[PDB]
Design a protein around this ligand. Structure first.
Ligand SMILES: OC[C@H]1O[C@H](O[C@H]2[C@H](O)[C@@H](O)[C@@H](O)O[C@@H]2CO)[C@H](O)[C@@H](O)[C@@H]1O
Length: 402
């Protein structure tokens, strides 16, 4: 019989003589034993579909060829919503891949095991990536790659990309004279509009530690209002459409219909085959200030209820987080600037990667506070409601902030 995951208490129902389980962290109650659900002797991995999951699977076969231990890569939709649901019952994948921002929430709920890399392995990764996966003093995941949004532009349509958001409206005008658009990017996910929204740090940026104040002052401030108003105004003046998602933006750029998009390194792959001559460069400034994308560190956390933690450790440390492991993933979909020093040193020669790190260091590594999931949803609603005209910018942001 396996040991119980953190927070779990085993109990007896006096009325039926039936054992049940109660979790003091999540208040979850159930008849099935939380441990013992995840199958032992194999590795099941969840990663997002836009990532190099097929490349990750190659590392999985390499692991199986060497060890006999099967590795299974799955990419469900909304895995960031599904993992906490199942793992809170003791079920789910052994390893979950996602940006670090959601791991703090997972960690507080007792869903992620503390990882145990020794000092020698820690030296192999940049310390700032270990910081992204530290929750309440504990390392709760293996950092993989640094994800910063960059301005991606068509070199043929636009040899000299705009340095400011402000000059885009007029640029869109003279590109419409060509039957083109200046800029199209996913307006449905707050991840993509945030760099503009946070740009102006006049009201909510903390110079004490270089962090945007999302919990005290919050998104209801004049700086965020200016950013979202500029966004809405591009839409009213018809330089952007409120309905543009990832799919639409991607297609239009890779068909050369628009001069610019905003996206991460995972997107480079599809552009490469489209053979648009593209550049990856710094995001435009707004109000004299650099855009501040929330930077994600794609991380691999281990399920607290998993019986394969040492399997997971071996796989992540000695197969994935190597030069040949990351390359296998990187060739499938570009990871961005990796956490592994030795591999990143080769990638840093790539100007696209230099551009990624440049936007990263102008932006901010996301907080991993438990509230991140609520924050993202609040901002998303505000943007969507402001952009559709359903609310004004003040109202949208007032309601967003609580
Ligand atoms: O839009 C909110 C969303 O932003 C981030 O998600 C990114 C993710 O980090 C990237 O790896 C890529 O998959 O695009 C996502 C945006 O669609 C946050 O990590 C996520 O928690 C948040 O919901």
């Amino acid at each position: 019989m396996e040991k119980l995951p953190p927070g779990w208490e085993k109990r007896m129902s006096r009325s039926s003589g039936r054992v049940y389980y109660f979790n003091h962290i999540t208040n979850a109650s159930q008849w099935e034993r939380p441990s013992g659900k995840i199958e032992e002797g194999k590795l099941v991995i969840w990663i997002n579909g836009d990532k190099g999951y097929n490349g990750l699977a190659e590392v999985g076969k390499k692991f199986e060829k060497d060890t006999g231990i099967k590795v299974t890569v799955e990419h469900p939709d909304k895995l960031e919503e599904k993992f906490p649901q199942v793992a809170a019952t003791g079920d789910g994948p052994d390893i979950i891949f996602w940006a670090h921002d959601r791991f703090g929430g997972y960690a507080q709920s007792g869903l992620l095991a503390e990882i145990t890399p020794d000092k020698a392995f820690q030296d192999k990764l940049y310390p700032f990536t270990w910081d992204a996966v530290r929750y309440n003093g504990k390392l709760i995941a293996y950092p993989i790659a640094v994800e910063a949004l960059s301005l991606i532009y068509n070199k043929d349509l636009l040899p000299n990309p705009p340095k400011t958001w402000e000059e885009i409206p007029a640029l869109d005008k003279e590109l419409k004279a060509k039957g083109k658009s200046a800029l199209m990017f996913n307006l449905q996910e707050p991840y993509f509009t945030w760099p503009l929204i946070a740009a102006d740090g006049g009201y909510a940026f903390k110079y004490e530690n270089g962090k945007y104040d999302i919990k005290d002052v919050g998104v209801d401030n004049a700086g965020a209002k200016a950013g979202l108003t500029f966004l809405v105004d591009l839409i009213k003046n018809k330089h952007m459409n409120a309905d543009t998602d990832y799919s639409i933006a991607e297609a239009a750029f890779n068909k050369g219909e628009t001069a610019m998009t905003i996206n991460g390194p995972w997107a480079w792959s599809n552009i490469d085959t489209s053979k648009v001559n593209y550049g990856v460069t710094v995001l435009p400034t707004f109000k004299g200030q650099p855009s501040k994308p929330f930077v994600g560190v794609l991380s691999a956390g281990i399920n607290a209820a998993s019986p394969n933690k040492e399997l997971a450790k071996e796989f992540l440390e000695n197969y994935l987080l190597t030069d040949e492991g990351l390359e296998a993933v990187n060739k499938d979909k570009p990871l961005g600037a990796v956490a592994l020093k030795s591999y990143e040193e080769e990638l840093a020669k790539d100007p696209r990667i230099a551009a990624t790190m440049e936007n990263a260091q102008k932006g901010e590594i996301m907080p991993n506070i438990p509230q991140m999931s609520a924050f993202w949803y609040a901002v998303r609603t505000a943007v969507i409601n402001a952009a559709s005209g359903r609310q004004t910018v003040d109202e949208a942001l007032k309601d967003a902030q609580t």
